[PDB]
Each structure stands twice: as C-alpha cells, then as structure tokens.
RNA sequence: AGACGGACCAGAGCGAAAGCAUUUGCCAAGAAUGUUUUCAUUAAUCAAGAACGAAAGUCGGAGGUUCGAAGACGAUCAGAUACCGUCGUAGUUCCGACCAUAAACGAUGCCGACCGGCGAUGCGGCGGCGUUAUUCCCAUGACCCGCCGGGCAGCUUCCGGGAAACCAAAGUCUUUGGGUUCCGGGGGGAGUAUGGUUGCAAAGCUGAAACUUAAAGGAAUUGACGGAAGGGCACCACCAGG
C-alpha cells in the first residue's frame, strides 16, 4: 500500500479527481507513480529496447554500469519513455519503469482527408531533435500502416497511432537520441495552433482551489 | 541591395510575431503587399492594417493577434500550369486541411482554391499558415 | 580550441604592430604581448637607510628613487614566477591584485 | 599532537544543555556526575570528554548567544526586544524637507501641504573611472 | 475537433494564454492562472466574484508578465488610468 | 551561396558536370584506365593455364598459409 | 487595484512616504522599470510616482484575498532588514514565513524535511532572494515582489516600486499592505486609524 | 615535419631536371 | 661616420590590404558629419583581363656603425659537424628594375533587411544648470548632464542555434528558396610524374594514374603521467649523529 506525501496524492487516494485530463489541463507536475497505476491500470504494457553497458576507468580497473531504455503505453493515446543506469540490470529496469510511468504525456490524433470515423493518424506534420538526429512525422491515409525503423514503430503503436510515414536525418544508430526525438515530436502535437482552435477559454476552478476544504485537516 | 520588396516584409512580420509583439512597421509599402495582406486578413489570420502615405514608397502598419505560425515567400516567381498544384501544395503545406498558397494571375491575386473554382493558373508568390 | 578570445594579444583592429625585446630573454616579441611592469624602487633598500641619514651632510635628505620600465617574455615570466596559470572561469578576469 | 572533538561528543553536549540547563553549572566535577545520572554512556572516558566540552561551552553561554543552542531565557529577552516599540518616530518634526521636483509631482497630485524646498546645486555625481 | 457528425474528439482542449494567444502544454511548468477579487463599490469587502488571467512561460521568462496583466486589468473595468 | 535564378540552367548543369568527376566511382567507371588495366576485359570469369603452385602468408594477428597458384 | 472609488490616497499616507524616503530610487535604471518614473533631478536619483505605487499595492492585496486559506501563502526575506516586518505580517494575517537561508529544494524534493507546496510567494528583494523565484518555475507559482528602480525583473508578475534599501521604507510598505488586506477582509473599518504604529516593522540595529 | 618534407622534394626535383637536361 | 626614432604608447586612431610614429615646409587625394543645393535608376556581384603586394631572394651602382645564415675556434657530451662563449663573410642601409609567396588568421566572401539590454571610448553635429578660462562679461577645448549618426571593441541573458567548445551572429534551416561569386566529396600515392605557360635563376600557375589501406580525424569526459605550478606528509626519505 501507499501513503501520499503531498496534496495531490491525498486527493487521488480519495475520489475527488476523476481522471488524468484535468491534471494535464493545469500542467501540474506529478512526482508519484502510485497515481498512474490508479487511473491507468492493467491497460498498460511495457517493453525494453536496449541495455547499454557503459564503463569508467579508475586506478585499479574498469567500473561498469548498465543503462536501460523502456517504453510504455496503453494503445489509446498515452505513451511514456524512461531511462536509468545502475549496477544490477534488474534494479536498472525497475527504476526506469517508474520514471517512464512518471514522464507520460498525451498524444493528439486526427484525420488525413475526410472525417469519417475515429482518428487514425496525426493532424499535422511535426519534427523533433536531440543531438545530431532529427525526425519528421507525416500523415497518411487509412490502411498504409507505419513505415519506419523498428524503434519508433514500437513506440508509435504505444500511442495508438495506426498509419503514418516517416523520415530521418543524421546518426540514427544512437538509440537514445533517436528515441527521444520521436518522443519530442509526439509531445508537441497539443502545442500546434490550428483553426480548429481559436475559441476563447472558459477558465475552470483549479482543483487545488476548489477542494481546499478537505485538505486543511478536517 | 533590396532586390525584392515582399521578401523582407514577411520576414519582419514572421520574426516579430515569433517573439510576441502586437504591432510592427514595414517600410517600402508597395501595391502587391496590400493584396497579400488583404487576403490573409480576409481569412482571419491577422487584424487590420493602416497604410501611411508619403510622397515616396510609403509606409504601413499592421495589427497582428499572433495566431500565425509562419509566413513564407517563394522566389523566383515560378509558373504554375494547373496540374501541378497537388505537387506544390503537398510539399509546402503541413496538411490537406488548411494553409494557402497565394498566386497572382490574370484575374488578380487569389488563393489556390479560388483559382481552381475559376479554372485558371498563374505565377506563384508565397504561402502562409 | 580557442583557449582565449583575445588570442593573447590586445591588437583589435590594426593589421600590424611593432616589436620589442625581452629584457632577459633577448627575443623579439610584439608590444601588446610582452608583459609590462614598472618599478619605482628606492636606491638603498630599507637596510642602510638609518646609516646614511645619520652619516649625511645635509638635513634629512629626501633621498631620490629609481625608475624603470620592464618588458618580459611570456616564457621568461612564468619561470620568474611573476604570473601563474589559472583555471577556466578565472582566466576571464582583467583585474590585478592589491 | 592534537585534540579535536568529534560529532558524537559535540552533538550530545548540545542536546544535554538544551534539556538540562538548570541542573548544570560551571564546575566540572558536578557536571561530570549529573551527565552520568541522566544518561547511560558505555564508557568512563567518553563520559569525561563530553563534560569537558560542556563546561567550556557554558562559559560561552554566559554572554553572547550561540548558533545551535536555543535557550528559553535568551529567547524571551529576544522576544521583549522584538516587541519593543518607541513612542513616536514617523511624525518627524512637523517640517518635511522636500525638493522642487517632488513639489511639481505633488502639485500634479493635488497637494499644497506643509513642506519645504531650499536646494540648488551643480552636478558632480559619478566617480573617477 | 469535429467529425462529419458534429462530434467532439481530442479528449481535451488545451488552455491558451491571454497575452499572446499561445498554447500552454502539459509540461510547461512555468504557467499560471491568477485570480483577482472584485469589490462592492461602496466599502471594499470582496463579495465572491473573481477573474482569471493566464500566462505562459516565455513571457514570464522574458520579464513582461508585469505590464501584460496591467493592460489586461486596464481594460477590464479594473486598474484605472494611472493618469 | 547558391545561384538560384530563373535562367541559370547552363551554369548549374555545367557546375554539376565538372564537379562530378571528383567522385571516385563515377571517375573509375567512365574512364578507361581501370578498364584497360583490369586483367578481365570487363568480364566475370576467365579460363587460363597453371604454371606454378605457391603458398602465400597472411596478415599479423593470424598465422597460416593460403595455398594459391600462379596462372 | 485602485479604481476611482472610496479607497485612494487621502492626506496622511503621503506624509509617511515622504518621511521615510519612499520616493527616491537609486541612480541606474532598468528598461522594465522606466514607466514608473516621473523625472531625474540634478543628482542621479530618480523620483518615483506615488500614484502607481499605490495603485499596484492594492492589486497585490486583491490577489492575496482571493486565496481563502491564508496559510498557503508564504513570505520571504533573507536579508536582515525585512526580518521583523515579515514575522509580524505573518502573525497579522496567518501566513507561513521563511526568514534567512532559504535551503534549496524546499518546493521540490517531496521527501525533504521542510517540504511545502504553497500557492503564492511574496519577496522583499529579487536580487538576493533569487533561488525561490527560480524554484517557482519548476513549480507553478504566481510571484510578487518589492522592487527598486534597478532590479532585474524576471519570473515575477506583480512589481511594487519602492525603495527596498531603507529600513524605514521597507517595513512601512508592509504596514500598508497588511492594512489593506484586513480592510478588504476583516474588522478594520477603512475610516478610523489602525492601532499599532508603522515603527513596529522597522529594523533596529543593536544600539541599546 | 612538413617544412622538411617539402624541402627534401625540391632537392630531388632539381636532380631530375639536371639529369634530364643532359638529353 | 652610419644606423635607430625610447619612456608618453592605450584591447586608442588611419589605410583596399601589405602596413604607418622626432621638428617644420610643400604637393595632390579621402572617410564620417551638416545640408528645404544638383542629375534622375545612372545600380549589386562578377569568367577573361589589369594595378598593388611583409621577410627571404635575384640584378646594376653608392655605402658599409650594429647584428649575423656560412665558416674557424674554445667548452659540455659516450659522440655534437647543435643548444653556450669569442671572431666573422653574404646580407641588414639608400637609388633603379625582377619574383609574386606566408598561421598573407577574425583559421569566419560581398550586398541588404530583421532580431534584447547596459556602461564606456574615438570623430562630427545639436543642446543645457555651472565652474574655470583671459584681461573687463562672449564665441576655444576641459570637464559636469543628455541626445543623434555611422565606427574599433566590451560585459550580461533559456532570443535562437549548434557534435560540442561556443557565437547578437556561427541567428531568422525538415515551418527547408533575399541576390550573387569561389570552392569541397574516406585516408595515402601527391600538389608527385608528364604536357603547356611566365621568369635572368630560384620557383610559381594548371594538374594525374597504377598501387595501397579500414580506419585517419573533431569536441568533450574519467584515469595515468609530467625534468608544470600551489598546500601538506614519512627516519622502509633527508639534515645532524650512533
Ligand atoms: Mg599580419
Ligand atoms: Mg562512394
Ligand atoms: Mg581572376
Ligand atoms: Mg621584400
Ligand atoms: Mg633584401
Ligand atoms: Mg648589391
Ligand atoms: Mg660579434
Ligand atoms: Mg596561398
Ligand atoms: Mg585561409
Ligand atoms: Mg557551424
Ligand atoms: Mg538550403
Ligand atoms: Mg580524396
Ligand atoms: Mg587538423
């Protein structure tokens, strides 16, 4: 079981907050994976991508540590990425799963041509970068499937995207950067401003502010 | 030297709006810009603009409401032939929904949709979204 | 790797500069490199002062000084322990000590 | 050939004072005994060294506070000198010395109150570069 | 976002700023909404109605949140003409 | 930068021509020097006669004899 | 926000600002603090307008009154001067104070000893108390300050032009601020003068 | 060093011109 | 008698760059500022071609203090046809013609716009309290306080970029197009061989191929090392001594 240290944890332990959307609407940081396991539970699958044995010299002999890459998603518009290094590969894997749950995001989806059914691809083309590799995601019709290397393919399905094209630039054979770039890409979909937007905001009540009463120890 | 009057202004619109400004001033104040600005405003991407007069090139001011991402120009002014629109517009635009390539033509200055509804091609100037 | 931005010499907008010669080394270096130093020392150095001024002929005899301009090489300087190496962030101070 | 005390010695000396400042005094051999009576140390020699630092420390507490030692009696004497108020200080002398530039701002702020203005002087300001 | 049956997708709609019409993201941890109180017009004494002003990170890092709110207030029947 | 006019084609087309020879593969193929110097006349296989049998030594980290023939 | 209404500079507070030198800034000027200026005199000491500095002091108060639980608010003064005022300001409205040596990580690092997640932040100086202004960027917090004419203005949302050097001016400005927040919400009438003196917030050097 | 690789060559290139001028 | 023009000499000025320092006189050019003068698109960049171009060097005269490639000696060294010391030729100096190279570096093409602040410095113009000026009050600098232009630079920042170091430009670049010029395409062979061209010679310009090879390289990190520097330490180190 788990005790929340802070405000936000105390509320989700109760039934005040109902979902994750509100948390994102106010851009609130989360620092407790016990929350993610509450809302998103058992619809969430994970996999490792690589185990990379870095090492360092000292006076006696090399000291090696194992680093790890993990990706997590539910196939309905969420995706996470996590990294961590330690000495035992299990403890390495365990912690990065926690960070991966933690730095989870939403991902937007839209249509290519005509708007019949549910969205299957991205609305608009976007890009990303991290240190000598650039990535570019492009919409496609309904049925092509994803065309890419295995890495982002493993990752884009976890968002729940169905169809897309793909291109790339630079040294793709460094997986760490090649992964984070496509994650930077699908992070910045809810930051592009379309004409679908441009309606004013209807500002809500900031959950900390509305449930002040229960928090002050009653 | 300033071999092109339209290239510089859109840059000086883009940079400012990329920063967070509310107004800008762009100097040489030529005819072709006025059409270009009118059609942007008409679709709603900017506010009004007041065009200062002097016994010279003139001057001009715009009000942004910066819901614009990028404004662009294509030079040299190429020649379109009404079957290549698709090949131009897929590899300049972000999607098949929005964004307009503007072109001069015998009827005037218009966007690509209106050109196809009037069934005529022309010469290309720029693009915005 | 530019270890410095000045490139070690305070030229900034000439084209060419005259040289000088190290006072010890005897080598030919520019005037914007070539550490400078200025001496305002006395002549008797704090030891024979009492002896002279008591064995004088005049009345307290203000006792002149000695003035010199000095030029040093970069190499000859560090060996003379005038200046010393520094760390990365502290290289960027153009202040002398008290 | 050196004698420095460690963290275990110091921290306990701090805690002992911060509880039992009344039991203790300025004599070592009494301070020795009380520490034995209240606390249960495993060793005779550790017993000794703690008290020797305690007694050195009391002489400091006599005058001048200390960083990590909060004593009641000191803290109320602080508290008195915190709540201390004078009779009057902001009513200065019924004459307020004022300059002309203020008087213009005051005049624009609609005040013809009681004030003064008797200053003119050439500019000196900054210092030698 | 609507389909051809007027439905609504895009599980939420992200709050925009008020000062640049830029969007706030799920990880822009330097964004704020800000409440301010309204008075009874006779004797102070906040009565229950307050407003909201939303700011993004880029403006708050540049050092321009001060006047943005000020001119937001200077329009809303709230801080008057300083002259 | 780049030329980028509307009637610049002769220059660009020219520039690509003289500047393509600085590629190793194109230069090798379109000049006859490698071709006339290849023992095979632009061919895959070839018949020939044996006249010796020798053993060639290998590089440093390995050590062996690789049993070749003069033909 | 000082609108045209009953609340406005009468004749008495002005005497106090002039008495303590709450209208002389320093010499150097930031380009952000150049709209709160009236003029430069002969000597390089700029005059601050006592119309905007009162019309923003109210605005800070209206922010604070929005927040019904006062203990979520936090007040900081690392410097010796604003020490006493802050402790009385905390007492006089139920805030949570932090005086001297703000330890890093107090708003991050959930498993720290003195961890606390407030909603609003008040400051005497932005150039000395520049950690929490930063740490309010890793966490959403609106930020309020007492700023002089030369003050690098960043990560902050409500600036109140004062003279943050003089002990008289500092503790004076708090006295006003504490006064309004109680007028706006409480038993203080807004007509007849409030009991305690604004000398209680001064910083007394160890002289006697 | 390259200054001396450059200089060794010229000494040689003279011997070639000198040898070749005999014919 | 012949060279050289100290300190003042500055992250100061001028020039297309190379580069420019005693006084005075003469000769002809030039930038910036100021302008309610004038002509009216006359312009930007540029294959071929043309001027200038540190030091060394070559050619013919005059001159030859100082320094000093070659060269000879004395020392150190296992050896030194080097580092050190003493002598000392070409040259270093001026007049007139050749050559056309350099880490000839801001290792960063030219033109034009846009993009954040701060305090200074140099030229010109505009203003203002006051002090001196001088000889009775003015126009000269000097400061004091600001402004404006176009300059050599500087400090600071989540502007933004970038492999990073770092940079108000190396920015406005997968949201890719302002105008135009020259040039690069794994490492060596090789700026070699040959052909043509200039030059008195030295050399310069243009410029290969067979063959060989799986790595050469850039920025930053952790150790180790150092006849590199700053603090300490030990009789399995030293001093003084048994
Ligand atoms: Mg040079
Ligand atoms: Mg190839
Ligand atoms: Mg040429
Ligand atoms: Mg020469
Ligand atoms: Mg010569
Ligand atoms: Mg001669
Ligand atoms: Mg000699
Ligand atoms: Mg060259
Ligand atoms: Mg070069
Ligand atoms: Mg680069
Ligand atoms: Mg390009
Ligand atoms: Mg090659
Ligand atoms: Mg190299």
mmCIF file of N, CA and C in Angstrom, chain B residues 52-120:
data_model
loop_
_atom_site.group_PDB
_atom_site.id
_atom_site.type_symbol
_atom_site.label_atom_id
_atom_site.label_comp_id
_atom_site.label_asym_id
_atom_site.label_seq_id
_atom_site.Cartn_x
_atom_site.Cartn_y
_atom_site.Cartn_z
ATOM 1 N N UNK B 52 0.277 54.193 -44.043
ATOM 2 C CA UNK B 52 0.718 55.577 -44.005
ATOM 3 C C UNK B 52 1.138 56.000 -45.401
ATOM 4 N N UNK B 53 0.811 57.232 -45.762
ATOM 5 C CA UNK B 53 1.191 57.802 -47.042
ATOM 6 C C UNK B 53 2.260 58.865 -46.878
ATOM 7 N N UNK B 54 3.195 58.850 -47.813
ATOM 8 C CA UNK B 54 4.148 59.917 -48.029
ATOM 9 C C UNK B 54 4.366 59.967 -49.533
ATOM 10 N N UNK B 55 5.043 61.008 -50.010
ATOM 11 C CA UNK B 55 5.239 61.184 -51.446
ATOM 12 C C UNK B 55 6.465 60.404 -51.910
ATOM 13 N N UNK B 56 6.418 59.113 -51.619
ATOM 14 C CA UNK B 56 7.520 58.181 -51.736
ATOM 15 C C UNK B 56 6.914 56.787 -51.828
ATOM 16 N N UNK B 57 7.731 55.767 -51.574
ATOM 17 C CA UNK B 57 7.250 54.397 -51.499
ATOM 18 C C UNK B 57 6.064 54.266 -50.556
ATOM 19 N N UNK B 58 6.076 55.020 -49.464
ATOM 20 C CA UNK B 58 5.055 54.936 -48.443
ATOM 21 C C UNK B 58 5.523 54.105 -47.273
ATOM 22 N N UNK B 59 4.619 53.939 -46.314
ATOM 23 C CA UNK B 59 4.876 53.172 -45.104
ATOM 24 C C UNK B 59 3.553 52.560 -44.676
ATOM 25 N N UNK B 60 3.598 51.686 -43.676
ATOM 26 C CA UNK B 60 2.442 50.850 -43.366
ATOM 27 C C UNK B 60 2.627 50.210 -42.002
ATOM 28 N N UNK B 61 1.507 49.900 -41.357
ATOM 29 C CA UNK B 61 1.457 49.345 -40.012
ATOM 30 C C UNK B 61 0.386 48.271 -39.989
ATOM 31 N N UNK B 62 0.622 47.205 -39.227
ATOM 32 C CA UNK B 62 -0.325 46.109 -39.088
ATOM 33 C C UNK B 62 -0.536 45.792 -37.618
ATOM 34 N N UNK B 63 -1.667 45.155 -37.333
ATOM 35 C CA UNK B 63 -2.020 44.667 -36.010
ATOM 36 C C UNK B 63 -2.191 43.161 -36.107
ATOM 37 N N UNK B 64 -1.497 42.418 -35.247
ATOM 38 C CA UNK B 64 -1.273 41.004 -35.523
ATOM 39 C C UNK B 64 -2.331 40.073 -34.943
ATOM 40 N N UNK B 65 -2.464 40.043 -33.618
ATOM 41 C CA UNK B 65 -3.174 38.960 -32.942
ATOM 42 C C UNK B 65 -2.533 37.623 -33.319
ATOM 43 N N UNK B 66 -1.334 37.430 -32.784
ATOM 44 C CA UNK B 66 -0.407 36.459 -33.322
ATOM 45 C C UNK B 66 -0.820 35.013 -33.156
ATOM 46 N N UNK B 67 -1.868 34.636 -33.885
ATOM 47 C CA UNK B 67 -2.255 33.247 -34.074
ATOM 48 C C UNK B 67 -1.710 32.680 -35.376
ATOM 49 N N UNK B 68 -0.548 33.161 -35.792
ATOM 50 C CA UNK B 68 0.112 32.746 -37.016
ATOM 51 C C UNK B 68 1.393 32.005 -36.667
ATOM 52 N N UNK B 69 1.723 30.998 -37.467
ATOM 53 C CA UNK B 69 2.894 30.167 -37.217
ATOM 54 C C UNK B 69 4.080 30.631 -38.054
ATOM 55 N N UNK B 70 3.930 30.604 -39.374
ATOM 56 C CA UNK B 70 4.958 31.062 -40.287
ATOM 57 C C UNK B 70 4.293 31.720 -41.475
ATOM 58 N N UNK B 71 4.958 32.741 -41.988
ATOM 59 C CA UNK B 71 4.611 33.377 -43.242
ATOM 60 C C UNK B 71 5.813 33.263 -44.149
ATOM 61 N N UNK B 72 5.563 32.908 -45.401
ATOM 62 C CA UNK B 72 6.617 32.497 -46.288
ATOM 63 C C UNK B 72 6.515 33.152 -47.648
ATOM 64 N N UNK B 73 7.619 33.051 -48.370
ATOM 65 C CA UNK B 73 7.759 33.608 -49.702
ATOM 66 C C UNK B 73 8.538 32.617 -50.537
ATOM 67 N N UNK B 74 8.189 32.548 -51.810
ATOM 68 C CA UNK B 74 8.885 31.729 -52.779
ATOM 69 C C UNK B 74 9.348 32.641 -53.889
ATOM 70 N N UNK B 75 10.654 32.674 -54.097
ATOM 71 C CA UNK B 75 11.257 33.388 -55.186
ATOM 72 C C UNK B 75 12.325 32.493 -55.791
ATOM 73 N N UNK B 76 12.473 32.477 -57.115
ATOM 74 C CA UNK B 76 11.827 33.232 -58.188
ATOM 75 C C UNK B 76 10.368 32.899 -58.412
ATOM 76 N N UNK B 77 9.619 33.848 -58.955
ATOM 77 C CA UNK B 77 8.201 33.628 -59.194
ATOM 78 C C UNK B 77 8.064 32.609 -60.310
ATOM 79 N N UNK B 78 7.812 31.365 -59.924
ATOM 80 C CA UNK B 78 7.644 30.279 -60.869
ATOM 81 C C UNK B 78 6.332 30.413 -61.623
ATOM 82 N N UNK B 79 6.118 29.463 -62.527
ATOM 83 C CA UNK B 79 4.957 29.409 -63.401
ATOM 84 C C UNK B 79 4.237 28.088 -63.181
ATOM 85 N N UNK B 80 3.017 28.180 -62.706
ATOM 86 C CA UNK B 80 2.189 27.021 -62.443
ATOM 87 C C UNK B 80 1.374 26.723 -63.693
ATOM 88 N N UNK B 81 0.928 25.470 -63.827
ATOM 89 C CA UNK B 81 0.242 25.013 -65.028
ATOM 90 C C UNK B 81 -1.005 24.189 -64.696
ATOM 91 N N UNK B 82 -1.544 24.317 -63.490
ATOM 92 C CA UNK B 82 -2.879 23.902 -63.067
ATOM 93 C C UNK B 82 -3.012 22.397 -62.883
ATOM 94 N N UNK B 83 -2.036 21.601 -63.299
ATOM 95 C CA UNK B 83 -1.977 20.189 -62.968
ATOM 96 C C UNK B 83 -0.963 19.891 -61.875
ATOM 97 N N UNK B 84 -0.080 20.834 -61.577
ATOM 98 C CA UNK B 84 0.988 20.653 -60.613
ATOM 99 C C UNK B 84 0.656 21.185 -59.231
ATOM 100 N N UNK B 85 -0.536 21.760 -59.040
ATOM 101 C CA UNK B 85 -0.926 22.279 -57.733
ATOM 102 C C UNK B 85 -0.712 21.256 -56.641
ATOM 103 N N UNK B 86 -1.125 20.020 -56.898
ATOM 104 C CA UNK B 86 -1.026 18.979 -55.894
ATOM 105 C C UNK B 86 0.418 18.759 -55.487
ATOM 106 N N UNK B 87 1.321 18.756 -56.462
ATOM 107 C CA UNK B 87 2.722 18.504 -56.166
ATOM 108 C C UNK B 87 3.370 19.686 -55.468
ATOM 109 N N UNK B 88 2.906 20.902 -55.742
ATOM 110 C CA UNK B 88 3.376 22.048 -54.978
ATOM 111 C C UNK B 88 2.802 22.041 -53.574
ATOM 112 N N UNK B 89 1.504 21.793 -53.441
ATOM 113 C CA UNK B 89 0.866 22.069 -52.167
ATOM 114 C C UNK B 89 1.056 20.960 -51.151
ATOM 115 N N UNK B 90 1.431 19.760 -51.572
ATOM 116 C CA UNK B 90 1.697 18.717 -50.593
ATOM 117 C C UNK B 90 3.052 18.890 -49.934
ATOM 118 N N UNK B 91 4.014 19.450 -50.659
ATOM 119 C CA UNK B 91 5.382 19.594 -50.187
ATOM 120 C C UNK B 91 5.727 21.025 -49.815
ATOM 121 N N UNK B 92 4.723 21.872 -49.609
ATOM 122 C CA UNK B 92 4.893 23.142 -48.933
ATOM 123 C C UNK B 92 4.053 23.279 -47.684
ATOM 124 N N UNK B 93 2.943 22.627 -47.634
ATOM 125 C CA UNK B 93 1.975 22.767 -46.580
ATOM 126 C C UNK B 93 2.144 21.685 -45.531
ATOM 127 N N UNK B 94 1.541 21.860 -44.361
ATOM 128 C CA UNK B 94 1.602 20.816 -43.342
ATOM 129 C C UNK B 94 0.522 19.758 -43.489
ATOM 130 N N UNK B 95 -0.600 20.092 -44.115
ATOM 131 C CA UNK B 95 -1.688 19.132 -44.222
ATOM 132 C C UNK B 95 -2.597 19.494 -45.383
ATOM 133 N N UNK B 96 -3.591 18.638 -45.601
ATOM 134 C CA UNK B 96 -4.570 18.795 -46.662
ATOM 135 C C UNK B 96 -5.823 19.517 -46.205
ATOM 136 N N UNK B 97 -5.779 20.158 -45.041
ATOM 137 C CA UNK B 97 -6.919 20.869 -44.487
ATOM 138 C C UNK B 97 -6.792 22.371 -44.687
ATOM 139 N N UNK B 98 -5.686 22.941 -44.221
ATOM 140 C CA UNK B 98 -5.521 24.377 -44.106
ATOM 141 C C UNK B 98 -4.150 24.774 -44.624
ATOM 142 N N UNK B 99 -3.945 26.082 -44.725
ATOM 143 C CA UNK B 99 -2.782 26.641 -45.372
ATOM 144 C C UNK B 99 -3.051 26.973 -46.818
ATOM 145 N N UNK B 100 -2.608 28.149 -47.253
ATOM 146 C CA UNK B 100 -2.962 28.686 -48.552
ATOM 147 C C UNK B 100 -1.721 29.162 -49.275
ATOM 148 N N UNK B 101 -1.562 28.689 -50.498
ATOM 149 C CA UNK B 101 -0.579 29.201 -51.433
ATOM 150 C C UNK B 101 -1.257 30.292 -52.230
ATOM 151 N N UNK B 102 -0.651 31.448 -52.250
ATOM 152 C CA UNK B 102 -1.201 32.604 -52.924
ATOM 153 C C UNK B 102 -0.434 32.814 -54.207
ATOM 154 N N UNK B 103 -1.151 33.225 -55.231
ATOM 155 C CA UNK B 103 -0.610 33.327 -56.564
ATOM 156 C C UNK B 103 -1.280 34.483 -57.265
ATOM 157 N N UNK B 104 -0.501 35.201 -58.057
ATOM 158 C CA UNK B 104 -1.079 36.172 -58.950
ATOM 159 C C UNK B 104 -1.542 35.458 -60.197
ATOM 160 N N UNK B 105 -2.458 36.092 -60.898
ATOM 161 C CA UNK B 105 -3.000 35.513 -62.109
ATOM 162 C C UNK B 105 -3.820 36.581 -62.799
ATOM 163 N N UNK B 106 -4.291 36.234 -63.991
ATOM 164 C CA UNK B 106 -4.917 37.207 -64.868
ATOM 165 C C UNK B 106 -6.141 37.832 -64.229
ATOM 166 N N UNK B 107 -6.791 37.102 -63.331
ATOM 167 C CA UNK B 107 -7.943 37.620 -62.616
ATOM 168 C C UNK B 107 -7.549 38.485 -61.430
ATOM 169 N N UNK B 108 -6.379 38.259 -60.860
ATOM 170 C CA UNK B 108 -5.918 39.059 -59.748
ATOM 171 C C UNK B 108 -4.968 38.270 -58.869
ATOM 172 N N UNK B 109 -4.973 38.632 -57.593
ATOM 173 C CA UNK B 109 -4.262 37.904 -56.554
ATOM 174 C C UNK B 109 -5.295 37.076 -55.810
ATOM 175 N N UNK B 110 -5.088 35.767 -55.764
ATOM 176 C CA UNK B 110 -6.012 34.886 -55.077
ATOM 177 C C UNK B 110 -5.266 33.692 -54.513
ATOM 178 N N UNK B 111 -5.977 32.942 -53.688
ATOM 179 C CA UNK B 111 -5.511 31.682 -53.142
ATOM 180 C C UNK B 111 -5.768 30.551 -54.133
ATOM 181 N N UNK B 112 -5.278 29.360 -53.799
ATOM 182 C CA UNK B 112 -5.295 28.284 -54.777
ATOM 183 C C UNK B 112 -6.692 27.718 -54.970
ATOM 184 N N UNK B 113 -7.503 27.702 -53.917
ATOM 185 C CA UNK B 113 -8.863 27.194 -54.032
ATOM 186 C C UNK B 113 -9.668 27.995 -55.039
ATOM 187 N N UNK B 114 -9.645 29.315 -54.904
ATOM 188 C CA UNK B 114 -10.387 30.174 -55.811
ATOM 189 C C UNK B 114 -9.888 30.041 -57.239
ATOM 190 N N UNK B 115 -8.596 29.773 -57.417
ATOM 191 C CA UNK B 115 -8.062 29.587 -58.756
ATOM 192 C C UNK B 115 -8.665 28.361 -59.412
ATOM 193 N N UNK B 116 -8.870 27.308 -58.631
ATOM 194 C CA UNK B 116 -9.435 26.083 -59.168
ATOM 195 C C UNK B 116 -10.928 26.205 -59.389
ATOM 196 N N UNK B 117 -11.613 26.994 -58.566
ATOM 197 C CA UNK B 117 -13.029 27.231 -58.792
ATOM 198 C C UNK B 117 -13.279 28.160 -59.967
ATOM 199 N N UNK B 118 -12.266 28.908 -60.397
ATOM 200 C CA UNK B 118 -12.316 29.685 -61.624
ATOM 201 C C UNK B 118 -11.542 29.042 -62.761
ATOM 202 N N UNK B 119 -10.820 27.957 -62.498
ATOM 203 C CA UNK B 119 -10.161 27.174 -63.534
ATOM 204 C C UNK B 119 -9.158 28.030 -64.305
ATOM 205 N N UNK B 120 -8.142 28.481 -63.582
ATOM 206 C CA UNK B 120 -7.048 29.215 -64.186
ATOM 207 C C UNK B 120 -5.842 29.118 -63.271
#
